[PDB]
Amino acid sequence: GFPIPDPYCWDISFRTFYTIIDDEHKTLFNGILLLSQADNADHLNELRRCTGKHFLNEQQLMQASQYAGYAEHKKAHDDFIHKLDTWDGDVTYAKNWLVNHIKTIDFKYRGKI
Amino acid sequence: GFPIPDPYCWDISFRTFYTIIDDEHKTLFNGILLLSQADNADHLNELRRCTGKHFLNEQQLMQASQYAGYAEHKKAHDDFIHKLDTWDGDVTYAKNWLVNHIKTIDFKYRGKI
Amino acid sequence: GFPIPDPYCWDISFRTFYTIIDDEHKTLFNGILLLSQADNADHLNELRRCTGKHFLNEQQLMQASQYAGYAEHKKAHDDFIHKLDTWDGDVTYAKNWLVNHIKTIDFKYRGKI
Amino acid sequence: GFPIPDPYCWDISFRTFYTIIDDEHKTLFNGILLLSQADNADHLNELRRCTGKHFLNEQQLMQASQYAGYAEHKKAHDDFIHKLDTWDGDVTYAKNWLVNHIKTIDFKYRGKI
Amino acid sequence: GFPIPDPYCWDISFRTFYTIIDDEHKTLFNGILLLSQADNADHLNELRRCTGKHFLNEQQLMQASQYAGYAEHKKAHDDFIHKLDTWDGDVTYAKNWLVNHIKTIDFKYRGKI
Amino acid sequence: GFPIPDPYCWDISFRTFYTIIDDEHKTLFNGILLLSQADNADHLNELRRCTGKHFLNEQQLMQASQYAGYAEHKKAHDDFIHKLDTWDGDVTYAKNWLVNHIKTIDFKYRGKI
Amino acid sequence: GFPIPDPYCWDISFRTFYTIIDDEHKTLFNGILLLSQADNADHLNELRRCTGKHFLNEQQLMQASQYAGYAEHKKAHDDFIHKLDTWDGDVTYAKNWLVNHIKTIDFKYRGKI
Amino acid sequence: GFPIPDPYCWDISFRTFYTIIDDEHKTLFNGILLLSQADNADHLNELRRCTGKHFLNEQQLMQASQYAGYAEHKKAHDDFIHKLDTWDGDVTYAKNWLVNHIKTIDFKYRGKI
C-alpha cells in the first residue's frame, strides 16, 4: 500500500525503466488527474483511450518474451477497463488502483520482459 | 438522417480528424460515385477492395485502444461487405448507407481511439 | 490534352495498377473538387496535405527501385507544391495539371517500380 | 499569453487532435512539473529525453506531408533543446515556453499534417 | 488449360501487376525448374520454402482487403503444400499445377486486392 | 550427442547461418553460463527472458515459410520454458538441453526457412 | 571464369545463405533470360526494376552491419545500372556480369552481414 | 579500471536496462572470447558483424531522443571499428576496450534515451 502523489501526476518512483512504458504511464496519471478536476465525458474518453492502448501495448510486451505472469496481469487490466466502461465517478478508487497496479503488478515484470 | 452530397464525393463535413481514416473515406465516396456512373464489375471491384481495406484498418485502429463499441461497429461493417458481395445494383442504398455510417457510427469513435 | 472529368473525380482511366498510388490519387481529385466548390483555407489545407503526402510516397516508391526518371519526376512534384504554397485560386490550372501529371508523368513509371 | 495550468499538467485545451502527439505532450508537462518539484539531474534527464523524442517525432509527422512550416518549426524546437542542454534552472521560462509553443506553433500544423 | 513454358521459367504472360507477387512467382518457377534438373532434397527444400512463404504472403495480401475468394484460394494453396510435403517426384504435375494456379486462381484477385 | 563447450559460450560450430538466430543463441549460452556461476533470480530472469523471446522469434521465422516441422519444434520449446518456470537448479540438464536442441532440432530448419 | 548456366536460371551453386538475397537473385537470372528470349522494353523494364530494387536492398543489408566493402560494392552495382540504363542489347555481357558479380563480389559479404 | 571478466563473457554488472542493448552487448563479449580462443577470420568476421550492427543500433537509439552525447559516442565506436578493420591480433586491447566502453560510455546514456 503506497502513497498517492499530490498533485496526481507521475513521479520517478514509478519508473519501470522501460521508457515506452513509463511514457504511457504518465498518460494514465494525467487521465485520472483530469477526472479529479471535472468528471465529464471528455476526460473519461481521454483516460479510457490511454488505458486501453497502454494495456494492450504492455500485454504485447509481456507476450514477446512469453512472460510467465501474463494471465494474472491481463485479468487485472481487463477488470480496470471494465470499471472504466461502467464509470461510477469513483476517482478515489482509480487513484489507488493505478498506484498499486504499477508498484506491485507492473514492477513484477521488470527484468523479465 | 443526413443530406446526400451532390456530386457524391467526400466533403469536410465528414471529417473524423483521423487523416488516414478521412483519406480512406474519400475512396469509398469515389467507389459509389463510379457505380452511380456505370454499374459494372470494374467499379464494383474498386469499391469492394477499398471497402474491405478500410473496414479492416478502421477495425485495427479501434482494437489498438480496446474500443468499447467495436463489436457493434464490426457487425455494421460486415453487413455492408455482405451487401457488396451480393450486389443488387441498389446505388441509392449504398449512397445512404455510407453517409449515415460515417456520421453516426464512425463519428462515435472520435476521441476514443 | 486529356479530357477533364466532370464531376472532377477519379475514374478508372487514371488507373496506375498500383493500388496504394491509385487510392492516393483519388484524394487529389477530391481536394481540387472541394476548392472548385469553395476556395477557402480548409479545402486548400486538405489538398495541400494530401498532395505533400502523395508526392513523398510516390517518390519513395520510385527510389525503392532506383527509378531512372526520379529526378525529373520529383521536380514536377516540387513545382506543383510551390503552386499550392503560392495559391492564387486558379482551379482550372490545378484541374488540368493533375490530369496531365497522372496520364503522362505517373504513367511512365508503370512496370518500372 | 495563455494561462499557465496549475497544477502544471496537460488539459484538453491543449488538444491537437493527433492522439500520438497529445500523449507525447502530456510527457512534456510532466517533465516540467517534476523539475518545479526538484531541480535535479533525474528530472532533467526525463524531460530532456521526452522532449528530444517528441521534437523528432513531430518533425517526422511534419515531413510526411511536406509541411510548409517545417523549417521554422524545427528551429523553435532546436532552440528549446539548447535551453535544456544549458539548463540554468529557470522553470518559469520552461512552463511558459511549452504552453506557448503548443497553443501557437503546434496548433498551426493542425489539418496540414 | 495453358502452355507450359520451356525452359520452365517465369514469363511476362504471368504478370499479375503486383510486383511483389510476380517476384515471388519467379521463385516458384525456379524451384520447379531445379527439381526438373535433379530431384533431390536441396531442390525440394528450396521450392518448399519459397512456396510456403509465397502462399502466406499472398494470403495476407488477400486478407488485407477482405478478399471474397480467400477460402477457396487458401484451400488450393494448402493442397499443393501437402503434395510437396509428400513429394512423389511428379515434376509434371508440379509444372502444370503452377501454370494453372497462377493463370486461373491468382489472376482472379487482380484489381480486388 | 555433442560435446559441451567449456567455457559454456557459443562457438561457430553452432552457426545456423541465420545471423539473427545465431545472435539470439549467444544469449541463451550466456544465460546458462550465469546460472552455472550463481544460481539466483537475476540470472534466471535473464535466461528466462532471452529464452522466451528467442523461442517466439524462432517460431515466427518457421511460420513465415509454413515450416513442416513447426509443431514438434514448438513442443520442444514449450517443454524447456516449463522447466525454466519450475527451475530446480539442474544446470547440467540445461547445458545439455541447449547444445542438443540447436545441433539437432534447430539445424533441421536450415535451408527451409 | 564461372560457367554460365544453361538455361540461364539460378541454381544452388549461387546460394549466399541469405534467403531474401537468394530470392532476389533468382529474379535477376529471370530478367536476363527474358531479354535473351526477346530484347524488348517489357523485358528490360522487368530486369531494370528487379536490379534497382535488389541493389538497394543488398546495400541496405551491408549498411546494417557497417560492412567494410560497402563502397566498392555499391560502385559495382551502380556501374551495372548504368549499363542497363544505356542498354545496347549485349545479353552476353549481362549473363557473364551477373554470374561473376554474385560468385566473386556478393560471396565476399557472407558471414559479415 | 574495471575488472576483466574471466571467462570473458557478459555478466549482469554490465546491465544497461535496455534489453535489446544488453542482448547485443552479450554478442560482443562472445566475439572477443572466440578471438581469444583462435585468432582467425571466422571469429573476426563474427565479432566485426556484431560490432558494426550493435554500433549502428545504439546510434539509432541515441538519435531517437536527440541524445546530446551522440557525436562523441559515435566517434568512440568508429575508432573501434577502425581497430577491427586493421586487426593486429591484440585481444588484450579489445577485452579492455569493451569493458571500459560499456561501463563508462554506454552507461552515460542510461535514462536519457
Curated annotation (Swiss-Prot), chains A, B, C, D, E, F, G, H:
Q: Pfam families in the record, alphabetically?
A: Hemerythrin
Keywords (alphabetical) are: Iron, Metal-binding, Oxygen transport, Transport
Query: Its Gene Ontology molecular function terms?
Result: iron ion binding; oxygen carrier activity
Locate the transmembrane regions by residue number.
Answer: none
- Residues binding Fe cation 2 are 58, 73, 77, 101, 106
Q: Which residues bind Fe cation 1?
A: 25, 54, 58, 106
- Which InterPro entries has this protein been placed in? Haemerythrin, Haemerythrin_Fe_BS, Hemerythrin, Hemerythrin-like, Hemerythrin-like_sf, Hemerythrin_metal-bd
Q: Does the keyword Iron apply?
A: yes
Query: How does this polypeptide assemble, per the annotation?
Result: Homooctamer.
Which family, according to UniProt? Belongs to the hemerythrin family.
Q: Which NCBIfam families match?
A: hemeryth_dom, Hemerythrin
> What does it do?
Hemerythrin is a respiratory protein in blood cells of certain marine worms. The oxygen-binding site in each chain contains two iron atoms.
Q: What is this protein called?
A: Hemerythrin
Native organism: Themiste dyscrita
Query: Organism classification, top ranks?
Result: Eukaryota, Metazoa, Spiralia, Lophotrochozoa, Annelida
